[PDB]
Symmetry: C3
Subunit: 113 residues, 3 copies
Amino acid sequence: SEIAALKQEIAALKKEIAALKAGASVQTAATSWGTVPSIRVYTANNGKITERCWDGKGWYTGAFNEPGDNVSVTSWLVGSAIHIRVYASTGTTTTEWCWDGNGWTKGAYTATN
Amino acid sequence: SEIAALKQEIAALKKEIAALKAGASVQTAATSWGTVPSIRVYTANNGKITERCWDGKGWYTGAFNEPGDNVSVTSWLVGSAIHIRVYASTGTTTTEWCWDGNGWTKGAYTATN
Amino acid sequence: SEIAALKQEIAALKKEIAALKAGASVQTAATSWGTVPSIRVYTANNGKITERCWDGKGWYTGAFNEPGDNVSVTSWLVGSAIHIRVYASTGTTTTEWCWDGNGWTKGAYTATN
Ligand SMILES: OC[C@H]1O[C@@H](O)[C@@H](O)[C@@H](O)[C@@H]1O
Ligand SMILES: OC[C@H]1O[C@@H](O)[C@@H](O)[C@@H](O)[C@@H]1O
Ligand SMILES: OC[C@H]1O[C@@H](O)[C@@H](O)[C@@H](O)[C@@H]1O
Ligand SMILES: OC[C@H]1O[C@@H](O)[C@@H](O)[C@@H](O)[C@@H]1O
Ligand SMILES: OC[C@H]1O[C@@H](O)[C@@H](O)[C@@H](O)[C@@H]1O
Ligand SMILES: OC[C@H]1O[C@@H](O)[C@@H](O)[C@@H](O)[C@@H]1O
């Protein structure tokens, strides 16, 4: 019956991986500012984070393009200038990315002192 | 020893799926507004997103009830009117949902132009 | 050929778990306040959530240290006092944690009434 147990094991093994990846989806983060408002939506997909932008008219693709399997975001206004920080994580490594009005740059964030 | 390798493989196979789903949990997103404040907490559970609300007294169930395995949220005030956008993702499909004071509606967001 | 199918099954079984955990990473949430600003970044890692803080000078470790596999956060100001709510989830159990200026405390949030 060992071969029959293998047939059952193969079926259980195909079910266990089908179910894993079936329930798998992309992960997003969002932030907004002003009264219009502007909206930025960051999507982690297959180890890549990309950005979509809304400034009142329609949606378009933003500059942000960095690696990661997970993303979070916060932002604040200095008067009307927007400042954005995006936290991108692969494995156990979190990288901070900074928008301060003139391009994305790597930030000072570290996970442990 | 092939049958013995199968016994070991079955044990490794039961460990590999137990560990996967054991570490699995629901995913949440949160937003807030005002000085009271009001709080909204969105929970993705088994392909369903639902909403819990706090307006200063206690917690209750909100109107939001849409499919998705992942959720993010942002909100803004126009004077004292709250506007909410919720980003719900299943597989590779992200759907935007809009609260503007008179019911949830599907938003214009798309992932690629 | 059953033993040969087992050799193939073992290879498929080692690929299916390698790929799972390979794509696995930590999950983060972020919030900010003021014009400096202050930033708080919460990281869920191996069932533990910890906190990193920025108040204008550099990054340091905060007080927050609670269990969970997933985290979300929101915050608001009452004048200049910061109030924070962190939502920590293990399995299907979401616990709210409250910062109101004098230590973290468990909040009134429940998932269903
Ligand atoms: O004008 C669009 C730009 O807006 C900024 O807020 C950032 O989100 C940039 O990544 C983006 O390219
Ligand atoms: O502008 C650069 C700096 O901005 C601060 O607000 C923090 O986000 C730092 O980690 C970052 O390096
Ligand atoms: O009054 C409760 C209502 O508040 C709005 O902000 C939305 O979150 C609705 O989904 C909810 O039903
Ligand atoms: O109110 C409808 C519209 O509101 C805007 O702010 C964006 O979120 C759009 O994608 C949406 O369709
Ligand atoms: O001063 C640092 C403190 O700041 C508060 O906002 C909280 O984030 C605490 O957990 C933290 O220890
Ligand atoms: O300060 C305690 C209370 O604060 C409120 O804003 C909510 O977050 C409650 O769930 C919490 O118990």
